[PDB]
Amino acid sequence: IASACLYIACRQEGVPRTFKEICAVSRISKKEIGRCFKLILKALETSVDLITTGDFMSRFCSNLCLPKQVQMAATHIARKAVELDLVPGRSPISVAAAAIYMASQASAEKRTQKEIGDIAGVADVTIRQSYRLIYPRAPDLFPTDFKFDTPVDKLP
C-alpha cells in the first residue's frame, strides 16, 4: 500500500516514475505494486492523468551523462513520434528509451542499448522493437537546429 501511494503521489505531482523504479526501491514485485495502485485508485474514487513520454525524459537523461542539448533533442523526437503515431499502443517508456538511444547515437556522446535499458528499465529487445518503428523517420523527428558530430543521416 505504501509503494502504491508513493507511485500515485509521484504521478500526481507531475514527476511520474515507472513501476520498475518503485519495485527497485520497495521490497515487493511490480505485480503487487500495480495491483495495489489499481485498488487504491478504485477505493479513493480519484484518478491520475495519463503519463506522457516527456515526463520521463529529464530523469532518464539526467541519470545518464547526456548533455542538455541531447535531452531536448530526445524529448522533441519522442513527442513528434507519438504525435505522428509511429509507435501505436506502445508504452511511453519504450518510446523514451528509443528516442534517448537515437539522440545519443547521433550526438557526440554515444550510449548502447544496454545502459539505456538499465536506466529506463526497458529490455533491449523492447528498445529495438520501438526503435525500428521510428527508424525510417529519424531526421524529421530531430530538431531543425541540432548540432552533432556523427551524422543523423547514418545510424545503426
Binding site: 525510417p136 523517420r137 529519424a138 531526421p139 543521416d153 547514418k154 545510424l155
Partner: protein, 49 residues
C-alpha cells in the same frame, strides 16, 4: 545505408506535395468543367425555342 533512405523519403515527401497540388488542380478543373456543362446547357437552351 540510411543516407539513401533519407534521400528517398525526402524525395517521397516532395513528390507527395506535388501530387497534392496537382490533385487540387484536377479537382478544381473538374468543378470548372461541371460548371461549363451546366452553363452551356443553359445557354444552348435559348435556341431550341
Amino acid at each position: 545505408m540510411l543516407s539513401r533512405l533519407q534521400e528517398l523519403r525526402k524525395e517521397e515527401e516532395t513528390l507527395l506535395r506535388l501530387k497534392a497540388a496537382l490533385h487540387d488542380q484536377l479537382n478544381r478543373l473538374k468543378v470548372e468543367e461541371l460548371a461549363l456543362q451546366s452553363m452551356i446547357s443553359s445557354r444552348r437552351g435559348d435556341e431550341m425555342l
